[PDB]
From a paper:
MHC, also known as HLA in humans, plays a crucial role in orchestrating the immune system recognition and response to viral pathogens. Similar to HLA-A*0101, which is one of the earliest identified HLA alleles among the human population, HLA-A*2601 possesses a similar characteristic for the binding peptide and acts as a prevalent allomorph in HLA-I. In this study, we found that, compared with HLA-A*0101, HLA-A*2601 individuals exhibit distinctive features for the T cell responses to SARS-CoV-2 and influenza virus after infection and/or vaccination. Furthermore, we determined the crystal structures of the HLA-A*2601 complexed to four peptides derived from SARS-CoV-2 and human papillomavirus, with one structure of HLA-A*0101 for comparison. The overall structure of HLA-A*2601 displays the common characteristics of classic HLA-I molecules, with the extracellular region of the H chain folding into three domains.
To fully understand the specific features of peptide presentation by HLA-A*2601, we determined the four crystal structures of HLA-A*2601 complexed to SARS-CoV-2 T cell epitope peptides EVF and CVA and two peptides from HPV: DVM and YVA. CVA stimulated both HLA-A*2601and HLA-A*0101, but there was no significant difference between two HLA allomorphs. In the structure of HLA-A*2601/CVA, the P7-Val side chain of the peptide points toward the pocket C, whereas side chains of P6-Ser and P8-Leu orient upward, away from the PBG. Meanwhile, for DVM, the side chain of P6-Ile inserts into the pocket C, and the side chains of P5-Tyr and P7-His arch upward, forming the “switchable” bulged conformation due to different position of secondary anchor residue inserted. This is due to the fact that the pocket C is shallow due to Tyr9, His70, Thr73, Asp74, Arg97, and Gln114 with long and large side chains in the PBG, and Trp156 contributes to the volume of pocket C. For CVA, the side chain of P7-Val can insert into the pocket C. As in HLA-A*2601/YVA with P1-Tyr and HLA-A*2601/CVA with P1-Cys, due to the absence of negative charges, Arg62 and Arg163 of HLA-A*2601 are not drawn toward the P1 site. As a result of repulsion between Arg62 and Arg163, Arg62 rotates upward, moving away from the PBG, causing the “open” conformation of pocket A. In the structures of HLA-A*2601 complexed to EVF, CVA, and YVA, the PΩ position is occupied by Tyr, forming hydrogen bonds with residues Asn77, Tyr84, and Lys146 in the HLA. For CVA, it can be presented by not only HLA-A*0101 and HLA-A*2601 but also HLA-A*2902 (48) and HLA-B*1501 (49). The epitope can be cross-presented by multiple HLA allomorphs, which can serve as targets for the design of universal vaccines.
Author numbering:
A (entry chain C): 1 to 9
B (entry chain B): 1 to 99
C (entry chain A): 1 to 274
Write the structure that this text describes.
Amino acid sequence: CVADYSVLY
Amino acid sequence: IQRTPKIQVYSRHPAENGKSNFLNCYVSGFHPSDIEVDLLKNGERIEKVEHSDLSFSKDWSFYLLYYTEFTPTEKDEYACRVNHVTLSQPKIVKWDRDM
Amino acid sequence: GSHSMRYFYTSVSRPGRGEPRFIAVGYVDDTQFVRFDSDAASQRMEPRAPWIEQEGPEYWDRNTRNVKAHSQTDRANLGTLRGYYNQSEDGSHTIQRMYGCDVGPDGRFLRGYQQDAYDGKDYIALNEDLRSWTAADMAAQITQRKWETAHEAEQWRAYLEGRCVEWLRRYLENGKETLQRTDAPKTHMTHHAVSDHEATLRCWALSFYPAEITLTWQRDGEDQTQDTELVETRPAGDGTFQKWASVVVPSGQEQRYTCHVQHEGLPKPLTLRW
């Protein structure tokens, strides 16, 4: 199951 | 920096003449991910070739499996042809039955 | 043994042609089970292993929705990074990401991780405590300060110590028969003449799983590492792997050389002699 959180630089 | 692809051509099962098999071209250790790979039957590009989903190793370098089904014989020779930004001319590696 | 779940993301900009291309794949151990390709017609997370098709449409709706968000965020991320580095717009650039979790052989949490790379070199990584980061250069420390001002880690930590382990344990049960197996190597030797004074001895391991394996030559007992070739372990295309190791030997000495093979599926290690 992929994560729900997004990773923005 | 960019990294040049390592190439291996081999069959899925040990080669028995007249028995249906799969021909494989595995390219790995390359960067960046743009790469063009062709399988060749007597210098002419095999048309139905499939490839796996792009992924990468712990050192961030990419790998890919290209493969078509085939039935080997005594006369038919095969090869994998690979071009990459890091290659001056396309490299060709021939399917040797014993590597 | 231990098990792992891992997702791999690659976004690659293509200036002058379209929007950037995004490719995600997911692994349990050495077995792929899902994929997504932003260039494909389907626009869905698609299955790639037998034992995942048994998940209902809610599964594929959430995963698709989430993977698409991640691709958009990475098309943004590509643009931000080419500012921090003052790079031109004509150039193609890459963002890669790996995240997931490990469980030990009793099923318990062992490690979570998330690492990001730009143009093939480390950019920023989550520390093993899951509450801080390590950055590789100046540009990445801007990101490290951003993520410290908000409280990103706690979110990362929730997934890695929570849903990640939980779904890894579920996958390990559903595909028990694929994922908890070990296929021992099928082994043999071949012989080829280089000329009259030397010849090649080649030791094969075929159709094994998982991919970890050790082929070593010993002439008379010393770990022979001269004149030995050792090819990168490669996939067969059916879920198993292959490997060989050769050694050039002088005509008449073949009986000195043994090949030694270790693998998780072997009751003992194997020895082969010509």
